[model samples]
Target: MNIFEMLRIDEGLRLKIYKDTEGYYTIGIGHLLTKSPSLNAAKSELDKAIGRNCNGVITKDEAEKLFNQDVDAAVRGILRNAKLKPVYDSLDAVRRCALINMVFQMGETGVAGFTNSLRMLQQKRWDEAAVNLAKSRWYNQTPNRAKRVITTFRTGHWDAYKNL
Candidate 1:
């Protein structure tokens, strides 16, 4: 599957705002509004994303649009990042998915900190990259989804995500 499809499964869609495991105010397909710990900032950002004044509720179409914006932003975020752009250049589509997947969850700078993992990915060392990622605190925080992305890195398939 493609990045959007893979992310849709892993991120999980929601129509109502809720606290993510890390307690960020999140809405739609993992659209993180504020870790400001700012509910006001979160609400304002939510409004910006959906083009409407919103309370706790979001429409299905709005959610889908938000998901597209997030995935697209992450895709551009990965591609435009100077450090990762070369790696993005070197990998095949499947491998690129794993790389972009990391960016989707962690953002560019966050994934940028995975030194050994980036080394492994840059070298096309799939299993080692997976191992390195599984070694992270991020792995501890989101084990199952992390496993799925790690498995994608290890095995080169989007099939690992069975969020259903």
Candidate 2:
């Protein structure tokens, strides 16, 4: 996956800052915490992982770089499970990206549970695949996002946002 797409997945369309499980201030796709000269150094070690100037939030450019670094590793992580690899690779770019996004959000094993959807994908049944995706619990959990993803799968275009 590319940096922008990854950023859209992780950070959402709008670039906002949030804390992770450890409560460190993070911006972008897992950029972690960074230190600002003005702020007290509570987590010195963690600060170093991000960069000296990182504090509160960061620029889109900075987030993009951080997002880029992890794309290869993230893709590898998705590939590692192997359950969905062949079916994943067989799809076109839009569908592939949608699958990769699913794997990223839910691990490969988690996504593999969508057997009907994956089977439809393998058969190039776009409409049925979309229907299967929308019928899932995942879709129930995130209906808007599911619709966008299903649109991408069906149309082979990145229409995550209807306006886009």
Candidate 3:
């Protein structure tokens, strides 16, 4: 499924995922949503944020739109909460998906708490990856959403990494 679908969000609601120009993820009643990018004024902006994983050629403009200073502060806050480096220099699509989601919810630092989990993904240890993913505070905080993403990562059939 697409990232939106994986997150169980629709277009109308998706647009609102963005939080005051910056972005983050939120869990509600029974769904998960992420920060949305401005499509019209910054069409490439969405692609910039979604196209690349932990590594990709993102333009400065795109960076400004999706992850402005507000988003940066959010990521740092995530790290601080989790107390770890959410991302390693390298990343897999699944790992990136989780990182992005975490950054959207907790910020870089908050998500960084998954350092051990990310290392498992980097090693391609699917079972271990899922286990690590579920062990995160986020997993327990957002059980449904975490299970969904973890299943996709374990199954190795996420459509978000495909061409849009």
Candidate 4:
């Protein structure tokens, strides 16, 4: 796949012109829509989430540093404010991340867009949620990326970790 396809820069691309001129990947494209987190930032964020030195779920502090935004508060709020029902009555941390990441990228409205999927999730229908995740505008728009994420969720595969 091409870089554009890999990055999923719909809406508009934020070049961070100043940083790009310096040859560093310091840019913000779109508003968290299919965006890739900076490598170091992703690692740091994941580390803090699990309360360990190792990286896994990403931390708000890293987001603040990389995106220069107040992500910690937002993520914390997401954790506290949102009540996620198990997808098919089974909520694996990995799978939950897939769901939350989808919600994060699309927003609650976006998640709600998958009405049938949401119902399945609420009803603890894991398989349906996996299929639902694949059958959406977002998935259609970005097939490769969607497939990678959804497949990972379905199989509980951490192989896709890093460079998220």
Candidate 5:
């Protein structure tokens, strides 16, 4: 309920494979099947994505399956990181959801690269943390989405995401 709504809104839904911005084969709520851990592992997932456009279709069941796994993986990725785990543990569940939203978008490694933001979050310096988030290429690239997430960081609440 926490991270699910934001991801659905932000990531957008696609049941079939389509070329992403960088022209990689993607499917099922931004699942980059082309770069999936194992293409063979994605056999059935790709089975539904046999198109050059958004012509493919995976069932609601399949989409939900993919959605659950992706979010679960994102959560695990954040918790296992040496730097992020402590910071994540200190945050309230809502704030932790906000951070998972970041990991969902950027991947754990990418989010981990924000050394200063990580530190601000560690110290619970919400203002400084939001500022650090704004300074990133991520903020510039996706201001609307980033603004909402940064607001969660700023308030330690999920109010910014309530309407969305």
Candidate 6:
């Protein structure tokens, strides 16, 4: 399969930009375009190409390109911010993905602040790491999301949220 197919399987491409679960404007495989000049330009170009009704929309090919760019940066940031690279590298895909998702929502700097949780993660104490994550202000702000992240970390598998 192609890169686009891989990304589509994981991120779910959308033609139009819209607010994501966290209220950030996103488009094309979780690419955050919120208040960015690139988003404005893309919208304007689409409007010119397909009339006002098609504004804010992009083609699948365009979405693929954007996804590639953003995903590269996000992965690099995650790798850079993780203090215990060896420990991080040792994690399973689901656990590694939990860190990536948290970093995506919170940004590298913000995720780095989870000192206790990171420490527990490095120690391979899954339950303690989950508890530390739950005790954070981030957990208080988005309880369901926190639960999903912690659950994945604790269980080392992907478990979708039950409720919307």
Best by TM-score: 1
Best by lDDT: 1
Q: What is the lDDT of residue 62 in candidate 2?
A: 64
Clashes of each: 0, 0, 13, 9, 0, 0
Tens-digit lDDT track for model 5 on 37-144?
443545555664443222355666677777898999998888789978988999997789889989987889899899988888889999988988899888897799
Per-prediction TM-score, please?
0.92, 0.68, 0.46, 0.50, 0.83, 0.69
C-alpha lDDT values of all predictions: 0.83, 0.65, 0.48, 0.48, 0.79, 0.69
Give the worst 10-residue stretch by lDDT in candidate 2: 34-43
**Candidate 6, residues 1-164: lDDT per residue as tens digits?**
22233335445778887766666667677776655446666565545544455567778877767666666666788777546355568787767777776766677788878887888887889998888888878889778667877887898865443332
Q: Which ranges in model 6 have alpha carbons more than 4 Å from their true place?
A: 1-13, 35-54, 82-87, 161-164
As a TM-score, model 1 comes out at 0.92
Candidate 1, 1-164: lDDT as tens digits: 78888888878888888888889999888888889787888888888877789986799898888888877888888878888888888888897888887897889999888878888888989877877788888999999888888888888766686544
TM-score of 6: 0.69
- When 3 and 5 are scored with lDDT, the better candidate is 5
TM-score of 5: 0.83
**Candidate 3 C-alpha error for residue 81, in Å:** 15
Total clashes for model 2: 0
Q: Between the candidate structures 1 and 2, which one is better when assessed by TM-score?
A: 1
- Number of clashes found in candidate 3: 13
Candidate 4 vs candidate 6, TM-score winner: 6
Task: In angstroms, give how far residue 94 of model 3 lies from its true place.
Answer: 5.2
Model 3 gets an lDDT of 0.48
For model 3, residues 27-105, the per-residue Cα lDDT tens digits are: 1211123345433323344344446432223443443344344445544554454333433325555555545455555
